[PDB]
Symmetry: D2
Subunit: 503 residues, 4 copies
């Protein structure tokens, strides 16, 4: 008799007025001429072939096969065809490469982040490998010798699926992930054959990694003569496999069985003499990898806001199809008010995100003012923790908006919450990033540069007045209030950005 | 080399100063004589044999076996030994029965709810069957003929596992759960044999049920020739199986694959001429079933707060074992402030819950004033939506407090979020209960009785002023503000209750 | 250190001297011109893309999805991409269609059976659907009205994957498969709409079926008012789905969890008013369906022998790679003698199979003598039970030849035994076919025609003497000796055929 | 409507006339007084609580958990409660210990083998650990120092579940299992703490083992100064865990996913400095472990015949419940003749098995004549390969006797074939044991002692005449015919034993 119609998606570029308004403000005419048709195309893929491949990957999670039938240690990771297909899309659509083709100045990074914004929610979180790939490319561009750059960058930035590499970023060990000072991976001097000029061999265990689907990784290790703690750490480049395709003295222990991001392989592994090449100098590892973090944290933000948009698209569509007590849900004043509130949060998030992406683009093309560089540094952790918390809140409300159906996995709706919860954890928790914000304040007059910016652009906001009072408090009291400070700034900046983009 | 020590629990009665303070206020001396050692005993089981049985049930979810090997339709649901054991615990510890032994007046229900509070978080949500069992006993006690009470109550209230029955409550159909007016299950006059005086046969589909875990159920159906909508619905009692152990014309379609509560069988089923007995008169179904809803909503609340306590117990213990940047997490001011904030929320929730539990007890022993009965009616939906939202927020924060480990299933931590999300959905969503609160106001001056209660018991405040101003608004403006109104009231009653119990 | 190299296959046409000798004897020059390059091509696919697709299908068995997420009964069966691909191969390589292109007279069927012989062992038993498809085409060709032939034959005999249909054959019910007289499926007159001229609606349960893999099926049912037993049964044609792709009143109960053939969906289903079209007259069902049985039994035989060849190819290759006590296994006299014995059995089986395949071809093009038609009738059940038993014996010996590895599933070797066991059970057990042989003798002097054939074609022998003595026995003594009689005949015909083909 | 009744078992002692006749011949009066009531009791357990525990273990196969949630390598093997329960039965019922309590002389081993015969088919192959436990106890009794015997034998032979140990026998490596000469496990001298007087540390990989549920194991290793090949191998004792329960430098790679014996943990593991104690002298390992093989091979035989009896009990019962073509299966002459033939094979197997068990008992109490010791040596491999092949043949026929149902796993019938196939592989393949027979012939005039025995007890058998002609052939021709020779002897001896026991 009666059966409920479930939610349906529509082209994600055409359905997103906020994104279109933002790009009209941030993209110059020559950029729009190329970007808008590309984006409209990607928006179509997001609800057609990508959507199916993502569903396929989520329904067939990766499997570790440590041994072949005759006892050879192979450490294969079996993935779905859909997962492999989503990697190919990332290459051919230039989801990473677009940022590094800086034809459009600062707008190149904006255009790229718009591609990521459409791609990510339909990628089964392949966007995580892409974040680390982008971060790795920038790090190599900034710090690596010309020969290493010549070998690796054409792969990371390739638009050809056959040559495209992704990178892992292997920073977490059992001792800590927030704090890497306890890193126990040793780097012994290495003299031998290599295809990339390896200088050391690495011995240690990496506790969360993206396993072996990536061709390279960056990691931290402690050379034989180095000091303890963070300043005995150097940055290292390594390749996972040799010519023939066998792992370079890398052993996978197991895959993590995770709350969400289930299509994404996350492994514990051991480096057992893995050949590697030091980048930068002894002791410089932590501060050099800091430029990988800035990019991955802005990826995380954009992916979290794309996730919000996907949850709300499903909720909006359902609200026009589900009836209760005589009315469609969208026509119940309380239900509509809840949706409106979530959409308002979304608008803050997407404006804030692209405001920061623009700042990032400005810095990457050398056109950022001293003030803009400081703003980028302060706002990046704030953006990340802000959009992450919002994406979890919104995903949970959307699960509840579907009622009982929201709690049953074959509707696809519980995944929204399971996946969203990752965003406030990966690349730094709310508290770790709140403290990074407080430490950004202590350098280059950054607290005052932020204050001047807020006074210049919206002196009369309710957030600024409260924020000023908090910023006068003691050191440890500011730490205790660090979250409140972060969200006041995030909200103040979101409002400024929304006005700037006419949202 | 280094391995992190994971969280450990300790006796849940001794470790809970809040619960002890509340019980010292609410239980008279004679009740304490019986209750406190029972609770200390149950608090030990909660972290020993129950914890093991719950883990086993969560690791071995129920499985539907529709057919035996020779083609007989049997619709068996295979469960773990741990799940069966937790059912035995519910009987022998009197997790339901304690409330119906009313020697301690209003305190009998308070004592029972303290038992539930300790039991639920170590029950793999067997507490859900218990809520529906308790609700069914109350409905039968209030409305059923003497012969039906004599048959069924000794099973529902038994302390002997061999005799104990649980009940299902089958309201939800595909057309709706919030709104049951679209109920399509027909009740035809029945003149066949039964063991319980069946009067009708039921034909329809019940879309979320507790499957065949229960020996009986209450449900709604539309008798032949009855009016459309909720006004044509009657309340029906049925038993699931006959003498031989065969399902009484009930077919299980499948089990739901759920976000959480995975040990709990939740089934879609069809009634295919299921004999049933009408309770009460034609047209009275929804109003009679409200006494099941009120009890299950208070169970939900107590279970949500027990869940919060469990999440925080794990976080607190971990915070004394995990180090970062040289210090235990508990010694980082921001982490400590976050924990303190979550604990403050916990204290509001438990005080509010037992305040309402005491009111329920008062009404059940006939000692509640007219105003207190009205308070109970108004505060029950508020308590439910209030504690549910807090439980989800706190579980998500606790997941993030464990960092990466928090996101990995074998630590047991992701389950906190997956399970918590259920609390804001079953037995009513936030918005549906917000509206139930608003309809309660429009009956017997309930809004005015509520307001006098808040004014008498708490000083003037901006929140109070804000609430009074909201309560005068338009029909539709009150609806738009229904959530804000509910949380304003919830916060006020929580403060009042915390003061009363010296928390 | 040391790791054993596992078995490898090579092109299955080039590696099979027996098959090549048989085809040089049975195929005329014009047939060889077409067939030999086609077969060499298929022999390559059998060890490349087909082998990969079969492994994938065996590793991802079909899954029944009875309900969509919103409660619609859809009864989907999800299969692997590999399974779908192997269906495409069957069409494009003309694994069925080749027989019905009778330009080469009796040799068209011989050529088709050579294709099946190479295809089947790398098909994850998709060859089972093909047998039933071939059988259905023959039944329709022989018995169906022109309009039904015009509709259906272009699908069954299509070489285009977009147009190709397979058929199921639904005979078995819970009461019996060997004996269909207890068939309980009723056929009521039907006056509704259909796309194929349906005359009845079917109501009953079919206990082993190929589920919804097929677009059509043949089945038996009892029309209203018909006699009891097999004499009341008629043959029915039905299509599984309508225009919209919805099942035509067919419900799938579940898939069988089988010892082997795990990639093949085998379902229990209920016909719940399924429109169907009677073929032939009332009471003629069993006799008309015999032309499906005869073809499927010869398919079974060829598939059993292809299975034997696959098992021995693996054993032979392994025997040239595995060492024990200083020598390759092939150089141990006892191991070599065991292999030689299994190979001698293989040669009997393949010669016997193609001998009967040639007879089938002769009859299908109208060129078979009266005696040869009778030989075909007698030898078909014998061939089937004979090759089946040999396939099981040889598979078990090959499992043991691999030693411990033979018993471990990821080597692929245990599957040889699990799959082989099916061959002696479907389309008739050893005893049921032994009795079919005995009833065939009692019709048209068939026993005497058989005996003259053996005497003319083979010298006198103790086996021959033993057989003649058995063929004169009592009604019940012949039954007790039915197996011995069948294997005596099978061995005699195998020797005669081997001599004829110079094996 | 119609549903088939499935097969049911009855007390396995009372239902087995062949076993009872054998024990009346082999057990003296004082032995029968104790044994027969014990056996009747075990026969009841075999079809009640053991049957359920075995089903439970087969439905919940063991799982390897290499890491705890915090990264500690624990290599846990999770087993079902039923598996644990079947171990307890083995201890309390004295399934091993009974043989070593030699109150009844040679009849003690017979009584024990009768217990094994009833136990094994209902043990989910826990009888395999018991075989290795028995073998280990005998080896220690024969060759170990008094102090080691004092420590270990009370555990192996315990009737108390709390103190009972099982043993593994770790002889197979990747290089070979039939041939152990390629053993690569090194034994370095060890000086340190041990609880059992360890003398060496072991380094190597064992390719098939019974994992970590056993407390001890025997294995072969090559000391630092030893020769290559088999005479550089010494026999070693080791314990798997220390005081606290952690593995003694043993790492489990994975469990095998096997054709059958699915309840039994079979693991690949590495010895990584595992402390061990040499038993016997350097170079003596292979010949000392030969006395473990003799016991495990007779266990295998008895278990294989118990397996035959179980398959036939199910088939016999089904044959009295399934009808086809108007008659119960048992009443169809061809079906009855097939059953009779299988039962005749069973009678040969059980008589042969207990004839050899009696010989074993005679040798263990020092009462075997020179001729009887030689007969035991020659007949042991023959018994093992004979009963194994018969059990596979009979299991396959029984699967087919159940028709389609026989091929579907939830009937329990396919397991009969999957499990039976192990018997011809473990502890030696048919060919390896056939060659061991031929080598037994070359010592102590053994071929002539066997001939004299056959001439004395049944000169007129058809087997002897054929056997004599084969035994005159050349060395390599005897090897080529080794299987035929083995089965002729097996059949000749089975006939002699059947006459001796009045079967």
């Amino acid at each position: 008799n009666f059966y409920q119609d479930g939610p349906q998606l529509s082209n994600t570029f055409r359905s997103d007025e906020a994104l279109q308004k933002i790009l009209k403000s941030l993209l110059p005419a020559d950029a729009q001429k190329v970007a808008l048709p590309h984006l409209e195309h990607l928006g179509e893929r997001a609800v057609t072939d990508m959507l199916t491949w993502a569903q396929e990957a989520e329904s067939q999670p990766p499997v570790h096969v440590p041994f072949d039938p005759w006892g050879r240690r192979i450490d294969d990771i079996k993935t779905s065809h859909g997962w492999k297909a989503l990697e190919k899309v990332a290459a051919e659509e230039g989801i990473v490469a677009t940022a590094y083709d800086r034809r459009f100045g600062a707008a190149s990074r904006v255009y790229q982040m718009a591609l990521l914004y459409l791609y990510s929610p339909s990628s089964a979180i392949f966007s995580c490998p892409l974040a680390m790939t982008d971060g790795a490319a920038r790090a190599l561009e900034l710090y690596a010798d010309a020969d290493l750059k010549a070998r690796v960058l054409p792969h990371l930035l390739s638009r050809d699926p056959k040559t495209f590499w992704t990178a892992g970023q292997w920073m977490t060990e059992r001792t800590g992930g927030s704090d890497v000072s306890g890193t126990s991976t040793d780097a012994h001097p290495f003299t031998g054959t290599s295809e990339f000029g390896a200088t050391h061999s690495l011995h240690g265990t990496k506790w969360f990694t993206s396993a072996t689907t990536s061709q390279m990784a960056l990691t931290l290790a402690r050379p034989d003569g180095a000091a303890p703690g963070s300043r005995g750490l150097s940055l290292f480049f390594l390749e996972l496999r040799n010519d023939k395709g066998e792992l370079n003295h890398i052993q996978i222990h197991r895959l993590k069985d995770k709350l969400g991001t289930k299509a994404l392989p996350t492994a514990e592994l051991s480096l057992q003499g893995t050949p590697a090449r030091m980048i930068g100098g002894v002791g410089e590892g932590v501060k050099r990898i800091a430029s990988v973090l800035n990019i991955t944290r802005i990826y995380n933000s954009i992916c979290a806001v794309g996730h919000i948009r996907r949850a709300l698209d499903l909720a909006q569509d359902y609200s026009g199809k589900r009836q209760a007590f005589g009315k469609l849900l969208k026509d119940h004043p309380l239900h509509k008010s809840t949706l409106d509130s979530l959409e308002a949060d979304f608008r803050k998030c997407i404006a804030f995100s692209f405001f920061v992406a623009n700042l990032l683009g400005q810095e990457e093309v050398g056109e950022a003012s001293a003030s803009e560089k400081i703003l980028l540094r302060v706002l990046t952790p704030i953006l990340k923790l802000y959009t992450a918390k919002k994406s979890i809140h919104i995903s949970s409300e959307v699960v509840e908006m579907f009622g009982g159906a929201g709690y049953v996995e074959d509707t696809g709706i519980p995944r929204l919450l399971r996946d969203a919860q990752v965003f406030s954890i990966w690349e730094g928790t709310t508290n770790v990033l709140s403290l990074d914000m407080l430490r950004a304040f202590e350098k280059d007059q950054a607290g005052q540069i932020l204050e001047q910016f807020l006074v210049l652009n919206e002196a009369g906001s309710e957030e600024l007045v409260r924020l000023q009072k908090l910023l006068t408090l003691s050191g440890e009291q500011k730490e205790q209030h660090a979250r409140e400070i972060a969200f006041l700034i995030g909200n103040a900046v979101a409002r400024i950005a929304m006005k700037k983009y006419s949202l």
